[PDB]
Design a binder for this molecule. Structure first.
Ligand SMILES: Nc1nc2c(ncn2[C@@H]2O[C@H](COP(=O)(O)OP(=O)(O)O)[C@@H](O)[C@H]2O)c(=O)[nH]1
Ligand SMILES: [Mg+2]
Length: 155
């Protein structure tokens, strides 16, 4: 039956947030995308240091948080891990499901799902449902399963 849901998309700069929205369809960009009888309102929020203080506010009240990672940029994983754990530590975000996406699977040296889970310390995240997929926006790889997970959280 016809529904609407809301997602906030975060993660470091260059991880592929805006690309992902483009494939599925600056400080902020809001877009609505319709899939599987569901209209998804997406907040694509900047990942540069100066925008990270606004992540919490944009995440409050959403159906799901999508956390984008450049899985091939291994140097940035530590920072990515830190920002994700710092975000999920904010009490007002208690219990919101999080989908962690290891983007750029098409590139040499891309971390797989196991490596992302371990290196991002996802297993430590206890208050909520958390999922992690390896994807390529460029080659449209594992985009379908990502959309299915999102739609399943339309509530
Ligand atoms: N090889 C590859 N490049 C990607 C992929 N997704 C995004 N990119 C590239 O990564 C760069 C940053 O993407 P963008 O969507 O601007 O990242 P944002 O800063 O998180 O919004 C751009 O050059 C994209 O073309 C992917 O799946 N594979
Ligand atoms: Mg962007």
């Amino acid at each position: 039956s016809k529904e609407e849901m809301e997602l906030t998309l975060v993660g470091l700069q260059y991880s592929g947030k805006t690309t992902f929205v483009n494939v599925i369809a600056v400080g902020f960009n809001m877009r609505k995308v319709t899939k599987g009888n569901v209209t998804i309102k997406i907040w694509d929020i900047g990942g540069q240091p100066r925008f990270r203080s606004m992540w919490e506010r944009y995440c409050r009240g959403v159906n799901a948080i999508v956390y984008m990672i450049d899985a091939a940029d291994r140097e940035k994983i530590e920072a990515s891990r830190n920002e994700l754990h710092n975000l999920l530590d904010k009490p007002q975000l208690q219990g919101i499901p999080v989908l962690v996406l290891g983007n750029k699977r098409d590139l040499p040296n891309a971390l797989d799902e196991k490596q992302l889970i371990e290196k991002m310390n996802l297993s430590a995240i206890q208050d909520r449902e958390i999922c992690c997929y390896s994807i390529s926006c460029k080659e449209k790889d594992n985009i379908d399963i990502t959309l299915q997970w999102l739609i399943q959280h339309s509530k």
